Amino acid sequence: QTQQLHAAMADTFLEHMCRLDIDSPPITARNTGIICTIGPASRSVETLKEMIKSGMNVARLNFSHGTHEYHAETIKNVRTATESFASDPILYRPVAVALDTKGPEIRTGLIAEVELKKGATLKITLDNAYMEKCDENILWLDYKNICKVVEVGSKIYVDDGLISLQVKQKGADFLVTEVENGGSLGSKKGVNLPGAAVDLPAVSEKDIQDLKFGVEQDVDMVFASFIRKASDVHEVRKVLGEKGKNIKIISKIENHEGVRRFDEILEASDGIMVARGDLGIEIPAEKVFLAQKMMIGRCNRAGKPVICATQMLESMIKKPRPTRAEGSDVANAVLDGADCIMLSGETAKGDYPLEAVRMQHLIAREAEAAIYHLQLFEELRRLAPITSDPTEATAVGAVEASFKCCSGAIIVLTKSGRSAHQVARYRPRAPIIAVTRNPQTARQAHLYRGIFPVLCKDPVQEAWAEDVDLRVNFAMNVGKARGFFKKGDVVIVLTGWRPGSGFTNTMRVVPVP
Amino acid sequence: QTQQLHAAMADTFLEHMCRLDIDSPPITARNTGIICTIGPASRSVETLKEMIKSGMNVARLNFSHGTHEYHAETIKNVRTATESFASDPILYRPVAVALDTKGPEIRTGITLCDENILWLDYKNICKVVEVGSKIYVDDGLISLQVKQKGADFLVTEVENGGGSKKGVNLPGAAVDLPAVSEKDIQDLKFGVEQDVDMVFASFIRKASDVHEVRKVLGEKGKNIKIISKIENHEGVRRFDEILEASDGIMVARGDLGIEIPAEKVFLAQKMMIGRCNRAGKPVICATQMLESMIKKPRPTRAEGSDVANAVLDGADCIMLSGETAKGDYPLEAVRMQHLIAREAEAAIYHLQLFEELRRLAPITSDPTEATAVGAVEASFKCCSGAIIVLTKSGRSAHQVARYRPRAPIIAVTRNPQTARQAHLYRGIFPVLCKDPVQEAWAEDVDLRVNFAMNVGKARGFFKKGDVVIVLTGWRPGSGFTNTMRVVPVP
Amino acid sequence: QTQQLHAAMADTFLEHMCRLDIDSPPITARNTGIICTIGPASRSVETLKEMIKSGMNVARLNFSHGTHEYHAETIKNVRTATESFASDPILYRPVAVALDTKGPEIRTDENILWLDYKNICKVVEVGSKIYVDDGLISLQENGGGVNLPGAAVDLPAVSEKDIQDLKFGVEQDVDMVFASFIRKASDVHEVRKVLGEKGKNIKIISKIENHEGVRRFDEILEASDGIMVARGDLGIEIPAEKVFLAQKMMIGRCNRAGKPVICATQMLESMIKKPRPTRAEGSDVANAVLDGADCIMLSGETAKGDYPLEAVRMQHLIAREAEAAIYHLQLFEELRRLAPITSDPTEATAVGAVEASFKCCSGAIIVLTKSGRSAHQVARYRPRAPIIAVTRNPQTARQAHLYRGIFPVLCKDPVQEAWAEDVDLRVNFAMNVGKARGFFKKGDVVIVLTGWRPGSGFTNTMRVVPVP
Amino acid sequence: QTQQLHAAMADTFLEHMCRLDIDSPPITARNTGIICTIGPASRSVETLKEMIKSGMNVARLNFSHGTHEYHAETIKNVRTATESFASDPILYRPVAVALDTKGPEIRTELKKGATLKITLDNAYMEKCDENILWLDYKNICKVVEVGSKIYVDDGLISLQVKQKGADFLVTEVENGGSLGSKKGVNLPGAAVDLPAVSEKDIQDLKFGVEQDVDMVFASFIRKASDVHEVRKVLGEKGKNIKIISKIENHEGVRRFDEILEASDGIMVARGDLGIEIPAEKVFLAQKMMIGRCNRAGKPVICATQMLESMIKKPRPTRAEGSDVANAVLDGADCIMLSGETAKGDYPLEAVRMQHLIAREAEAAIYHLQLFEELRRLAPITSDPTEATAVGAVEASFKCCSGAIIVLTKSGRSAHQVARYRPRAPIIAVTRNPQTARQAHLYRGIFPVLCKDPVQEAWAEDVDLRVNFAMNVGKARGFFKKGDVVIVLTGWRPGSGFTNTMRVVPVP
Ligand SMILES: O=P(O)(O)OC[C@H]1O[C@](O)(COP(=O)(O)O)[C@@H](O)[C@@H]1O
Ligand SMILES: O=P(O)(O)OC[C@H]1O[C@](O)(COP(=O)(O)O)[C@@H](O)[C@@H]1O
Ligand SMILES: O=P(O)(O)OC[C@H]1O[C@](O)(COP(=O)(O)O)[C@@H](O)[C@@H]1O
């Protein structure tokens, strides 16, 4: 009568649906990471403490706005609030810090507003004499290569898709367009080129400086904007360089080229953000659910983290409760298989930052139980390469074992995170407690569905066996304290055959002491 | 390269997901019916003509507010806009008319009105509640827990705080308010008088509530379909009996989400859709699907998600409420549901869906079901432009829709009501033949099949030379559908 | 409770196995064609009538031995016996005649041994193995007819004898040829060429008998009309423990292509001397039908055995029991997944008809057909229900026994003036056939497949009708 | 690619068939146990040594015939043959001894259509003529109704009951034949009330205990109570001797479930079953029984006429090679030889053949859907031993391990791995001689008997035995240094503490 275990037993997906039960309560542990954008609503130490207690695992800093000193104080506040729980490692929740880059943009110049008439002509010019003299006849852009990347018939969107232009003739340093969808044109408006291969650099002058700030500020991950190809990922990696080699690169897929070149992008990245906001400007909004499900599926298939983002609980900016469409959207992202779900304006500037978080947490947990693990696991098992790698064999064996005995947890010792990530890719129902002494591994582990990172602070015991056991019991204490299991329950424990990374090979079924 | 047919051939659901392709265009035909609430924004004859052109199939009138005269004029305006396309039967689109009842409510002015004492109109509340039981006021704004129950008094402690005549909900309680209120009685009579196609019955909690709506409609209303609106915990609990007694179901998410934790609504939705899909009865997903478009010309990303996932869940019909009744952009809201539903329909994993549906398809001796399922399999085999079905009552085409073909079901009928009510079923495009009955029956049959051919051609569903499936029967009258033919479009 | 219908509902194959029930009786109809080799035991007119009554659908004639006069009289007697039933076309059973060729061969003191294959040095290398006298002797091994395991033997597609034997077959109006020792597609094209234009409608069934035939199976299947799993010679060429792999591989690939596959040799071998078979033999027959063989075969069991008739009756009993035990639920799911979205109306009609038949558990699928093609298309999707194929073409009726499920029936009535009534006549003929044979009764639902006009290629109409 | 791993990857069963490849060679290990009936052709110590080297795992003694003295000597010879290899424990193969009971029987020119009286009057106990026939089953009338069939001399003659008395029955002959003396009588569809064990059986069973047999094949089991009675005869002294119930008639098939639950395993006794039931239905009974045994996780034996022609011929028929293959594909834990090894001209060849076929068929199993299904039809219990076992089998698939190595005192931990039907061989390491012999009943279990003394450091004692397993697999040719294998151990000594799985290289 709990955790949708009746529906879990259904031999078909239809009967699985039919069995979903509002009176079947979930478990305590919530497996989907919650990423919260920080802003004036949620930036104080006191409000960040409650953000943490409400379920925030990752603090997102949006670098489209705010100075470096502004962002350094946000990061300070986040760390002050996070370490205010440090005294008891058993309860301490790690919180990661994500730097989301502004990235390359196309801006128009100065106009004050002009009215564009649907069906009228408008000329785009790269001639800087019209740079501060834009009007309903002539509009200047700052993308000096635009003529090389568009064709007669190509569409140009101005001000987050509000205005739609179609190129009717191309010149030298100008294009002549017809206004499809008119409206009020303004100054300094964002511009998108649906379907174009935009040749703006992978990282802007500003991103370059912001990225190097992220290294100095010891950020855990970068959300890299407007990634269109693998070479763009490689430039971000290169800018972060040697000292930033362990910072995770999440590519943001925000346009048609990124969706189409997705495979090469995913290969080069540590993870992916389905940036639905900008993506639904670049592509028809009715197609966005296809790109989301395709991307979640392919990341799931590759074992790489995927984040569903933007407007998930949007009304909660003004109202203390979501719309039904919004709660549907969060549940369905989890059902699709997103590792993480994201809050933007709902936490940064909204009237109800805490309710928004607490709601993603309630929905995430309800949806995690509603997942059809029976076919999910079968398909991932079917789709799993037969290879000699002992660490993979061990990971899959532990997930199989966890389903067999419906265990309270899969406990994993990990230095880098990788052994825990390997378990997460098989989508166990039980929560993965990733015991680590590496504080960065513990913060970054939040990117993966099911992983519950715990930061062990005990000294290394001189007998290695004792030291392993010490960390395994730390994990049992965390599970007991957090209410994931109780003394007598069975849990699965993963360890390796010598110290250091890459030797995970040992799966035990143990009672909770 | 089209209609997500690469994704359709995937051996696993996971691969099916991976193959979903924004560069793969859908077909013209949209299978999921669109139900539009009519109100001040959409009531004019001119606007309704555009609602129809945009894709509205059913006009919902909400009898929570409005005079009978107001509603009578709305219905009249819907019929004028509809019949203004009647001159060409090939392009004529039927539009049904749905009456959505106010239903039983609890209202404020806890005795049986200030910070101290509050008065409620529901007199049997003390018998239905217990100590610890929760009471919500003004659409779940305020929350109350009873600390002591008395004769005509409840003593509560307020949980969440923050007016006159406000709505009360009593979560997890068996409310004994009558099936059909005093105002409901008058309104169902008006529904009969005005020839409504369907009643959407509010706050159905059990089978006997549907039987009461059925009894009130009685012999004069015996062809009006009853769609039970599930809006509270009891109606989720007692869903199986309610479904058995009903002609279809509305997932009334608005109120449902006041009654149960907002985070559980997707479970109740997916359960009711799956179970209606299993039973072959129409299911409507309702409420706040494109809510932001009341004030904005474009929806949030979570809103287009919700509409797509509703279609993927298996809903026969989707709904708009304030979005089309009173918002600033009603035609846009309609057009947006048409676009998404169409994308999502291509995205369904028909391969497993059809597999699982027929694995429940009973081995009855019934020839009509055997013919229906053969036709759907044949439609998958040749990827047909359409399944064309001659039906008097709709039943023959309902039986095809039950197996969820990819191809559109052109249901040809001479019955105007049959044509309007077919919209409740995923994939049915009802066309109303007006040609006289031919002397020879065989010629009469062929005349309506050719009518359907011309409709599909005129709507861009198929062109000369394509292959379609045609379902007919061996003799006149309902219940004899037994003949499936694979024919080319002339 | 009948026809293993409880087991048929199992959602898994393990549970399907667990529900198989010896108290669940099969239907009357037996879908798997039985092919009988004729010799001294089974060549008299008297014995042949009983072979037919017992369930013989095809008369195999082994041209490894016998003169043209000998074989001429066997065929004469098979036709005499077959046509002794023609008086009532409702109960008359067509019987096909298959010519099985001798094929190319390698033939032969302890000091020096001579063989007749001139290119043997080129085709073999030091380390290669040579078997003599049906694998009884081995050379590089085993002391105590030459086979070249795993070698590309360049003997001709057909010998000189094969050419006049096929010529004789054309003269004698045989329905099919079982071509021996097929190694490549070009061998099949040679048999096709020799048969020529006058023998254009004679079906070529390739006998797969060696490691090269197996490795090159796909080009061979494409070029043939069907396949024989010739387990005898194939078990000499390859290790006998590997023969079931080859059998199942070929049956699977044949079902995948929708072409007839025959399982042959030693199926009921002990019944040459004994009146009933061993448990291994009963198991072999049942499993060949479960594998998906269109036809099963008897050689010495019927050619020279003491119990020819008991060997036929026993195959009939087992095949009928095994047909019920097939896990149709997944078989049909897989066939329908493994078949393409074509624009071909007849294919959509065929598959919809089989779908319908499962849905109402119909007593038959009745199909009018001139060439047999419309019925072949239906049999490809492996329906539980028997396929009553009505044809006016006697060659079509006789060749239709190659396909699982097809009960071919030859309509003798003249063509009716109006086409509508002509079709109804043949549909009623099918109804009368089914009732007389006990396949179904009045009130039962059947599926009926017709076209929209006369001539082949226009099958487009499926109807679900009660038996009148 | 080897052991049909291309076919192993097929998304469908049809495609799996289509990929089966004769040029894909098996692994060296062979998982299906082989039971050989020992008789005049296989009794010698020297012949038995070669039987063992050919692949005999279990020596079956049929007590239908032969004295206690004769059978005692057969056992002695099997043990002398078996222990001749005991010098090297790495190459030593355990061999089990199974006692097959005679069971409850019914014993006595007939023209078809003629009348025949079946009388129970002992006056005619030696005057069995064509007119009147005597039987030794006094209750036969109790369980005979008008219309019942009666078979005589292993189904050679058939009769139907037309009139009924108490001492007699008026039959008419269906299938005529030559009626001999003291021939076997079967009653199809009858609820025969003969005891679970005859007087002779009770003696032979107690002799079984005296002789320390590993298992009993109990003839003619028709109901749960029959199995309990066999269990009561073996008593506390024979409490560890495994009871394999022989399913030989309609009643046992119909009541299979209650019989399965009480037994330690099942024999599909095809010979006698095909006299009781129409021969064409036996394959249904076999598949039903193997499936349900697979589902219950209890060993099932396929038996009788599998390589029958090899009694006289050095090579089998195509139908016989097919039959052995299909039994393995069905999921039979063990395959059996009777006359082929007991009395035939080619006993060693019959064993080597079943060995060659078994191995091929084992590669040709569709593990993908087999393990999927086993795992779906599989309870969620708090049992850590079951969860470790399933995790090891999944791990073995994921990395295509060369073996699953399991330490087991009682055999239970290895039985639990074997029930998930891994492709990889289960090398079960035990110090318990009876555990090692009885483990042969289970598909995939290769028992090895460790005879090192118990090390004072238990961690070392555990590792000693894992390394012993490594040495066996290298010597046997199951794998080699650098190959990855799965190792199953427990957290403390004694049964029921298996909980540790490790993926490791062969050293
Ligand atoms: O779906 P229903 O109500 O059973 O109607 C289907 C009927 O339509 C027909 O195709 C034509 O019937 P009519 O000519 O009376 O309209 C019948 O053969 C068939 O029984
Ligand atoms: O299987 P075939 O050779 O295509 O024949 C099927 C034909 O049989 C028919 O049902 C009847 O045709 P005929 O009248 O020419 O015999 C046709 O409609 C159809 O095309
Ligand atoms: O299969 P069983 O009978 O449970 O035996 C498994 C046992 O074997 C062991 O690995 C070793 O046990 P011993 O040292 O007592 O032989 C235990 O850890 C484990 O419980």
Side-chain angles (χ1 to χ4, degrees), chain B residues 125-126 132 135-146 150-151 154 156 158-159 161-164 166-169:
Chain B
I125 192 184
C126 290
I135 299 179
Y136 301 155
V137 181
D138 195 10
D139 292 355
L141 185 77
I142 299 171
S143 184
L144 288 169
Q145 184 194 316
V146 173
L154 294 161
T156 71
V158 164
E159 292 185 347
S164 317
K166 307 309 186 175
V168 182
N169 298 77

Side-chain angles (χ1 to χ4, degrees), chain D residues 407-411 413-414 431 458 461-462 465 489-498:
Chain D
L407 300 215
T408 186
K409 302 190 77 77
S410 73
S413 294
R431 288 201 167 88
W458 182 71
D461 200 67
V462 166
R465 285 174 279 171
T489 63
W491 66 273
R492 55 146 292 187
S495 284
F497 302 110
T498 304

